[PDB]
Amino acid sequence: VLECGVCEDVFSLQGDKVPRLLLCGHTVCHDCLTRLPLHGRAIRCPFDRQVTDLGDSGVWGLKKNFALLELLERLQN
Amino acid sequence: VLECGVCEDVFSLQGDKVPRLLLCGHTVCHDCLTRLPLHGRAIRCPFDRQVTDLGDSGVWGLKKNFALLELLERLQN
Amino acid sequence: SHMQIFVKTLTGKTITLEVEPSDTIENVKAKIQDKEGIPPDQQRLIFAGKQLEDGRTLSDYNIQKESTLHLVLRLRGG
Amino acid sequence: HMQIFVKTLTGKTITLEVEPSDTIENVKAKIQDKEGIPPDQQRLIFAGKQLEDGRTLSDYNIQKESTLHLVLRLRGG
Amino acid sequence: ALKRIHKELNDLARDPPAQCRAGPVGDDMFHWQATIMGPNDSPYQGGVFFLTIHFPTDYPFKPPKVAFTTRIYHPNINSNGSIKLDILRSQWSPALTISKVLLSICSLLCDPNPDDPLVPEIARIYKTDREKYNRIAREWTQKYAM
Amino acid sequence: ALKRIHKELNDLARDPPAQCRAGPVGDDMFHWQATIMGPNDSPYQGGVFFLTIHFPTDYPFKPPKVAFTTRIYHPNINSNGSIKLDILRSQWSPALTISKVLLSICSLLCDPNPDDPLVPEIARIYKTDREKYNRIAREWTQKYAM
Numbered sequence: 307v308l309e310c311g312v313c314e315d316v317f318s319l320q321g322d323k324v325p326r327l328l329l330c331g332h333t334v335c336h337d338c339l340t341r342l343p344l345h346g347r348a349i350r351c352p353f354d355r356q357v358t359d360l361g362d363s364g365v366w367g368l369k370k371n372f373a374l375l376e377l378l379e380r381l382q383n
Numbered sequence: 384v385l386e387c388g389v390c391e392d393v394f395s396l397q398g399d400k401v402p403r404l405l406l407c408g409h410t411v412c413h414d415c416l417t418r419l420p421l422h423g424r425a426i427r428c429p430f431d432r433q434v435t436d437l438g439d440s441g442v443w444g445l446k447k448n449f450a451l452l453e454l455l456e457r458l459q460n
Numbered sequence: 461s462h463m464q465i466f467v468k469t470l471t472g473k474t475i476t477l478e479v480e481p482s483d484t485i486e487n488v489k490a491k492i493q494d495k496e497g498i499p500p501d502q503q504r505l506i507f508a509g510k511q512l513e514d515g516r517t518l519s520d521y522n523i524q525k526e527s528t529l530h531l532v533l534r535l536r537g538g
Numbered sequence: 539h540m541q542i543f544v545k546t547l548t549g550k551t552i553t554l555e556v557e558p559s560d561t562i563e564n565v566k567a568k569i570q571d572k573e574g575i576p577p578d579q580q581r582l583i584f585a586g587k588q589l590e591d592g593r594t595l596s597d598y599n600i601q602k603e604s605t606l607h608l609v610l611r612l613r614g615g
Numbered sequence: 616a617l618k619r620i621h622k623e624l625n626d627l628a629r630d631p632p633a634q635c636r637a638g639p640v641g642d643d644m645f646h647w648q649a650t651i652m653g654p655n656d657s658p659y660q661g662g663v664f665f666l667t668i669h670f671p672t673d674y675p676f677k678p679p680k681v682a683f684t685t686r687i688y689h690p691n692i693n694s695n696g697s698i699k700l701d702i703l704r705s706q707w708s709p710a711l712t713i714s715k716v717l718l719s720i721c722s723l724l725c726d727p728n729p730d731d732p733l734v735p736e737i738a739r740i741y742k743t744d745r746e747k748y749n750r751i752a753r754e755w756t757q758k759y760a761m
Numbered sequence: 762a763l764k765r766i767h768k769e770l771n772d773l774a775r776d777p778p779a780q781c782r783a784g785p786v787g788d789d790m791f792h793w794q795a796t797i798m799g800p801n802d803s804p805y806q807g808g809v810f811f812l813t814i815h816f817p818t819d820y821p822f823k824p825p826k827v828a829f830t831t832r833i834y835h836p837n838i839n840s841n842g843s844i845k846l847d848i849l850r851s852q853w854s855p856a857l858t859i860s861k862v863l864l865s866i867c868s869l870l871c872d873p874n875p876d877d878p879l880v881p882e883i884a885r886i887y888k889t890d891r892e893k894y895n896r897i898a899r900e901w902t903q904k905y906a907m
């Protein structure tokens with residue numbers, strides 16, 4: 307399994323711990339993303355401080371890491 | 384291990400088969416990405432036809448799926 | 461009332477969906493978007509060799525538990 | 539040609555193929571390639587001291603299988 | 616190219632969709648024969664239609680050439696078996712497999728596009744007189760596909 | 762918060778960096794003591810400096826409060842042990858761990874910022890007469906940190 311680089315909890319296949327992507331290419335769990343400080347309507351990646359702009363959907367507008375999810379689900383079986 | 388959804392070869396940790404990301408959140412191997420039709424500095428995702436615009440770096444400008452790479456390297460060891 | 465169906469996505473992997481007979485085809489496509497990230501406007505769902513139209517529901521097509529739908533890309537005859 | 543170690547932000551340890559003549563900026567370029575953090579955001583530590591760009595691995599007497607520590611750029615105020 | 620063609624073959628042998636079958640005729644991996652079952656509750660019900668598939672050298676990045684060998688009555692399919700379908704031309708996706716293409720073609724069998732037709736006459740029948748269209752399609756199915 | 766604090770602790774016990782150590786004093790998980798070794802080839806060489814760490818309730822999304830308990834001679838560190846460092850205020854990153862913060866603080870020991878100083882006098886000494894700065898820093902290290 308793989309854990310989130312912030313909370314170091316395990317990624318879940320859906321819900322509050324689902325792995326979502328930032329524009330820099332790094333992955334963070336949904337919940338940590340909701341708890342990051344909001345710079346106007348943008349958040350900073352914790353690993354490189356690069357900015358990802360959020361839309362009206364906020365953190366839900368960030369895309370899930372589908373490949374990582376497929377591999378994790380494969381590991382589950 | 385995990386394979387590319389186009390060529391169905393296994394992803395490599397670097398080189399021609401490194402997993403790169405599109406703005407839609409899907410991952411494709413570098414080599415397959417270089418072979419996609421380029422319509423004015425843009426490519427279409429094979430899974431949803433959504434457009435990713437390419438910069439001066441071309442396909443190399445697409446971000447690697449760092450989380451997937453970390454998990455794959457973990458499985459390799 | 462509450463059932464599970466299967467969907468064969470573009471990559472060939474089979475996903476399981478939590479649905480109801482009342483669910484419309486567009487709601488099913490919304491679930492497909494949530495799991496696979498493909499916009500509904502790009503989804504074409506097939507059951508028994510026939511396209512599933514948005515307006516109708518799973519009941520209208522008598523889709524029952526553990527049935528398998530097939531996902532292809534939107535197309536146009538010309 | 540030697541191998542060194544770098545402890546990244548997430549705590550994972552990576553191995554780098556380097557030479558004594560290599561500058562710190564080149565090392566940071568390899569870090570960017572593997573981990574996706576811009577060099578301007580990287581701060582490399584060896585023996586508790588910041589490694590300045592201009593100098594080389596030889597200048598800091600960095601030897602094979604030594605470990606550098608990656609932190610984020612910082613500023614005293 | 617060949618690796619993916621082999622993958623699609625393995626998938627078609629292990630777990631094909633109930634509607635279609637495909638495989639290389641003879642020793643040629645780039646020339647396949649396909650079989651489609653006419654969907655139920657349709658004028659093609661009970662029919663079995665064959666097709667030829669030709670893979671380009673740089674498949675899956677270029678679409679395959681798919682054509683009907685069995686005569687079929689359809690607005691978007693002509694007497695020579697050519698299929699005017701956008702996923703075979705400019706809407707092709709490298710992620711589409713032969714299985715997906717055949718399912719697509721069935722869904723087209725029961726959902727034609729008369730507005731932009733390959734065979735204008737058949738489209739005229741389809742729009743003006745549907746009963747006659749279904750009759751002729753059923754007859755063609757019986758004669759040519761059974 | 763508590764889960765990550767435990768993770769950082771497990772890592773610090775199993776394989777800490779050679780320069781620093783940290784752990785909760787007593788039973789309180791949110792109050793730690795830290796130890797930094799003065800870097801070699803520096804006025805702080807051979808010194809051992811202690812610090813207090815206080816974790817906010819929503820750590821790691823808010824930075825920890827870090828302060829020197831050992832007296833140290835530095836432009837950006839005052840007599841009360843307060844550290845003016847941007848990663849402790851508005852340049853904090855939730856991915857930074859206590860270990861990373863302590864290493865960061867060492868690198869700051871040998872790379873001060875006299876232009877924007879917390880202790881103006883020490884900064885003046887640093888800019889005008891570096892030899893004197895190194896002498897006094899070495900004296901403070903010997904007296905207070907050995």
Ligand SMILES: [Zn+2]
Pocket residue numbers: 310311312313314315334335336337338339
């Ligand atoms: Zn997290």
Ligand SMILES: [Zn+2]
Pocket residue numbers: 328330331332351352353354355356
């Ligand atoms: Zn990032």
Ligand SMILES: [Zn+2]
Pocket residue numbers: 405407408409428429430431432433
């Ligand atoms: Zn996509």
Ligand SMILES: [Zn+2]
Pocket residue numbers: 387388389390391392411412413414415416
């Ligand atoms: Zn590929």
